[PDB]
Amino acid sequence: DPNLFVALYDFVASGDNTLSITKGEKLRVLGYNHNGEWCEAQTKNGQGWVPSNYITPVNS
Amino acid sequence: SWYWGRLSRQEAVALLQGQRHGVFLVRDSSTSPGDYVLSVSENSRVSHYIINSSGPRPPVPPSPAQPPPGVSPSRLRIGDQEFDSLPALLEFYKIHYLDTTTLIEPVSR
Amino acid sequence: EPGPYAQPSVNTK
């Protein structure tokens, strides 16, 4: 998964490092956390901080 | 006041060096990304304990009641005890007997 | 070797 991921649930962000995203949406994760808890996703809208569980690689 | 971001190790010591007991401050670790450190000017020696802190500002939420993949909360953790954030952490070190005597106030004023 | 920091634990053997 070079940069192809997808959210399992609908995540909401308050503008902070996080990015309001819906469920079942495909995002490009090009960033991770030192502990592996957070996941930096990126899409046509831009970048965003999505949880490590709420998100998951696309169907390959 | 006590939250020092981007504080170099050499800087901390240079600040606490010769500083009476009770002076303490948090600083980002050099060889530890997204990790805080508790600084305390001991008796002619400045100690620095390693602390863990969440990366992004947003707090990561939990997964469904089902099996959680790579479950790793963003809460604060230090030694054999955890905390809600740095504020609570610093308070602990000040209330506990970690280093020489208890803490008094942060390097700031 | 594994001594990057102090780490308040107070246990040892």
Side-chain angles (χ1 to χ4, degrees):
Chain A
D1 294 287
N3 40 282
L4 223 57
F5 289 71
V6 64
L8 300 72
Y9 331 86
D10 55 297
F11 189 103
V12 182
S14 221
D16 237 348
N17 247 218
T18 26
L19 173 99
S20 76
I21 60 148
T22 345
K23 71 177 95 56
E25 194 93 51
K26 43 147 221 293
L27 332 158
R28 304 149 223 291
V29 182
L30 38 60
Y32 283 87
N33 189 285
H34 185 62
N35 272 74
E37 330 179 16
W38 266 114
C39 275
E40 191 191 30
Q42 185 264 124
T43 82
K44 57 178 167 154
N45 192 72
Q47 301 197 249
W49 272 110
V50 296
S52 277
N53 63 75
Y54 283 84
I55 67 106
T56 186
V58 299
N59 281 122
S60 42
Chain B
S1 231
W2 55 253
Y3 173 27
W4 283 75
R6 245 255 221 295
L7 184 94
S8 219
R9 302 199 321 166
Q10 218 84 73
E11 303 265 51
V13 181
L15 289 159
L16 278 77
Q17 178 105 84
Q19 295 307 324
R20 188 268 233 280
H21 322 137
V23 64
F24 70 89
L25 77 81
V26 67
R27 70 169 186 70
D28 232 36
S29 155
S30 301
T31 182
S32 328
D35 277 28
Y36 270 118
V37 196
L38 256 282
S39 329
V40 282
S41 190
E42 228 129 329
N43 48 293
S44 332
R45 32 138 146 197
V46 65
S47 220
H48 37 69
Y49 299 99
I50 182 141
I51 301 86
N52 268 239
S53 243
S54 81
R57 263 269 222 63
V60 84
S63 349
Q66 251 179 0
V71 65
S72 180
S74 282
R75 283 226 154 70
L76 240 282
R77 175 268 217 167
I78 182 50
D80 206 324
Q81 234 279 104
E82 298 134 76
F83 287 74
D84 199 351
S85 183
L86 254 154
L89 221 316
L90 303 159
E91 265 212 358
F92 177 42
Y93 282 39
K94 198 156 91 268
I95 304 138
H96 211 71
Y97 281 72
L98 225 90
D99 55 313
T100 311
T101 191
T102 30
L103 278 45
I104 304 178
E105 253 215 344
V107 291
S108 252
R109 268 191 256 170
Chain C
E1 263 68 20
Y5 284 95
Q7 221 154 61
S9 257
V10 184
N11 248 223
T12 77
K13 208 250 219 220

